[PDB]
Amino acid sequence: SSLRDPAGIFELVEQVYKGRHVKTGQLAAIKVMDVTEDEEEEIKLEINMLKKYSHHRNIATYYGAFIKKSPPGHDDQLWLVMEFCGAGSITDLVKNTKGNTLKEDWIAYISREILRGLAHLHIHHVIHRDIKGQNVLLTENAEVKLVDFGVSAQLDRTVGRRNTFIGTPYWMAPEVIACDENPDATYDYRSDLWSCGITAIEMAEGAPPLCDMHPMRALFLIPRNPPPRLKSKKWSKKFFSFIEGCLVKNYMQRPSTEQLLKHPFIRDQPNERQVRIQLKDHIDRTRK
Amino acid sequence: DLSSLRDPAGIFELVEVVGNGQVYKGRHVKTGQLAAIKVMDVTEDEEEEIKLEINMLKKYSHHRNIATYYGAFIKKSPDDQLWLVMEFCGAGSITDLVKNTKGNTLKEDWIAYISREILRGLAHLHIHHVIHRDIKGQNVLLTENAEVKLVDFGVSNTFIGTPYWMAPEVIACDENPDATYDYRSDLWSCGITAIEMAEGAPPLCDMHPMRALFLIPRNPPPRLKSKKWSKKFFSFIEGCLVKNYMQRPSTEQLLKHPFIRDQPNERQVRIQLKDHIDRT
Numbered sequence: 001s002s003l004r005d006p007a008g009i010f011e012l013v014e015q016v017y018k019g020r021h022v023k024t025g026q027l028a029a030i031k032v033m034d035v036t037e038d039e040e041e042e043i044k045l046e047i048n049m050l051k052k053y054s055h056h057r058n059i060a061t062y063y064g065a066f067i068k069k070s071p072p073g074h075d076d077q078l079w080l081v082m083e084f085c086g087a088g089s090i091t092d093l094v095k096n097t098k099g100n101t102l103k104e105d106w107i108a109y110i111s112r113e114i115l116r117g118l119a120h121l122h123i124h125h126v127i128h129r130d131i132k133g134q135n136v137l138l139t140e141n142a143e144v145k146l147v148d149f150g151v152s153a154q155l156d157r158t159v160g161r162r163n164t165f166i167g168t169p170y171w172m173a174p175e176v177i178a179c180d181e182n183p184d185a186t187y188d189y190r191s192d193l194w195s196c197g198i199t200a201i202e203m204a205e206g207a208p209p210l211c212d213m214h215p216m217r218a219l220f221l222i223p224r225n226p227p228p229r230l231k232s233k234k235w236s237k238k239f240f241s242f243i244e245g246c247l248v249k250n251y252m253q254r255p256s257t258e259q260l261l262k263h264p265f266i267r268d269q270p271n272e273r274q275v276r277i278q279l280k281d282h283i284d285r286t287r288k
Numbered sequence: 289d290l291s292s293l294r295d296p297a298g299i300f301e302l303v304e305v306v307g308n309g310q311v312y313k314g315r316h317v318k319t320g321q322l323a324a325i326k327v328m329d330v331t332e333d334e335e336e337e338i339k340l341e342i343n344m345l346k347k348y349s350h351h352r353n354i355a356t357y358y359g360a361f362i363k364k365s366p367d368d369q370l371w372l373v374m375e376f377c378g379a380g381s382i383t384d385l386v387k388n389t390k391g392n393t394l395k396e397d398w399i400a401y402i403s404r405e406i407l408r409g410l411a412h413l414h415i416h417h418v419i420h421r422d423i424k425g426q427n428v429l430l431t432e433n434a435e436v437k438l439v440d441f442g443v444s445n446t447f448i449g450t451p452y453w454m455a456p457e458v459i460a461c462d463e464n465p466d467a468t469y470d471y472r473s474d475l476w477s478c479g480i481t482a483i484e485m486a487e488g489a490p491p492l493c494d495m496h497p498m499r500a501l502f503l504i505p506r507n508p509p510p511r512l513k514s515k516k517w518s519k520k521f522f523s524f525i526e527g528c529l530v531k532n533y534m535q536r537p538s539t540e541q542l543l544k545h546p547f548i549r550d551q552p553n554e555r556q557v558r559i560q561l562k563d564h565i566d567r568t
């Protein structure tokens with residue numbers, strides 16, 4: 001809960017860059033930004049607005065914000081430390097997969113791990129705001145963890161030259177997009193649940209719906225088009241039902257994380273331990 | 289083609305990150321000349337989008353108000369890296385200029401000089417059927433000789449950028465589903481840039497970009513906060529920001545406008561800017 005110097009607490013090794021905790025040598029992921037005196041001041045107020053939530057196995061534990069005072073004359077550097085995850089992102093997992101599609105049991109496993117960590121954030125009144133394949137990471141083992149660099153006050157999005165940027169729209173729920181009949185872009189906890197159904201499609205198809213559009217045409221269509229659907233008809237009735245449960249157009253009628261955690265596609269995973277093995281086996285092969 | 293590109297090894301050096309593709313302050317080894325080097329990691333599928341920007345630069349960068357292209361190189365890697373080499377504008381951008389000024393604003397004669405140069409570079413592109421599509425204070429730069437140069441053609445895609453300089457017709461809504469572009473959308477961004485010079489920040493700066501994106505098509509054309517400006521300047525802003533693009537003036541018609549055309553201190557304004565850069 002303080003913007004301090006990284007000296008002695010954390011050190012970098014060489015946008016996210018690898019680092020280490022100097023005291024135990026424990027690995028770290030350090031997000032690096034460039035801030036002005038005004039942006040460094042804005043981070044101080046936003047750190048006071050941070051909510052308190054405990055450690056979690058499905059969330060890459062947020063350590064803190066530091067200001068690496070350097071260089072004199074140029075812009076200073078803001079560092080955001082978080083738990084280190086080795087096997088990369090779900091996006092990387094799908095890219096480095098045979099048909100750029102995952103097994104339905106792998107998707108069910110990863111979606112439950114996403115929902116588990118989401119449920120953690122939602123009881124502590126925190127919205128993730130950016131659930132997508134690129135922000136779900138895999139540790140050395142088959143552990144599934146949500147990216148967290150101070151998501152309670154969005155410390156990685158409020159400052160820097162890319163803060164004013166609208167961003168990538170493909171995983172945005174209808175309510176977060178301002179349009180005619182939606183003039184106030186309402187981020188709700190249920191917005192992460194739409195993003196989870198879009199992430200599930202990304203696991204099944206390699207890319208989220210509407211990926212073939214220019215980002216501005218996709219942004220216009222997400223609030224107007226009926227809910228996205230899986231292109232293939234191979235998938236089970238449980239998968240279609242889960243996607244249909246997440247991708248409710250009106251968030252007021254979309255279920256909570258708790259209800260989705262009791263959905264048969266997420267709830268009924270008999271091969272849970274076998275799927276957790278072939279995931280770690282995939283990680284092992286990729287390391288070569 | 290990209291296969292005929294040489295490694296930049298004894299040709300150019302990446303000195304210090306100047307902008308953002310990530311733009312470095314680059315130096316030619318043989319002479320010591322300063323150049324801007326845009327470094328972008330070529331994914332073997334993007335060898336078409338990256339190529340389009342290089343073609344535009346080779347084709348139209350020679351003009352007085354466009355930063356001149358020097359050459360391109362590929363540094364191999366066991367995802368290769370493309371080096372887009374072009375002119376080095378020493379002063380920085382108009383955004384940096386305004387913010388590094390007392391009361392974060394610019395003088396009306398400076399605003400008229402820079403505005404004519406943006407319109408000059410835009411006229412060249414529009415003549416040759418090219419819409420820049422990203423006119424703003426960040427993409428208008430100055431050389432050490434206090435000259436004006438347009439940069440960044442990596443728009444003319446996965447993340448939508450900043451909304452503030454977008455003309456209403458580029459933002460789709462029920463009445464405009466296809467977001468019907470035209471070269472006159474650059475003339476709206478020029479007007480937003482003249483307001484950004486005159487007030488430090490663009491017309492909806494204190495809003496969330498998604499609320500600004502919703503509001504730009506629905507609000508009447510922005511206006512200056514201060515009454516101090518001349519009737520010439522307000523009329524110029526009104527010309528750039530004609531809400532419906534069908535009745536917005538051309539780049540040629542905007543060059544003839546009294547705030548652009550009637551410039552008496554043309555050779556003298558350049559001198560006050562040349563003195564401001566000197567500050568170190």
Ligand SMILES: Cc1cn(C)nc1Nc1cc2cc(-c3cncn3C)nc(N)c2cn1
Nearest residue numbers: 306311324355374375376377378380439440
């Ligand atoms: C001294 C200085 C300080 N800043 C912030 N920039 C400076 N110099 C500079 C930057 C350039 C950047 C680009 C460019 C290409 N694609 C996107 N961009 C932004 N193109 C050029 N031709 C440039 C020429 N000179």
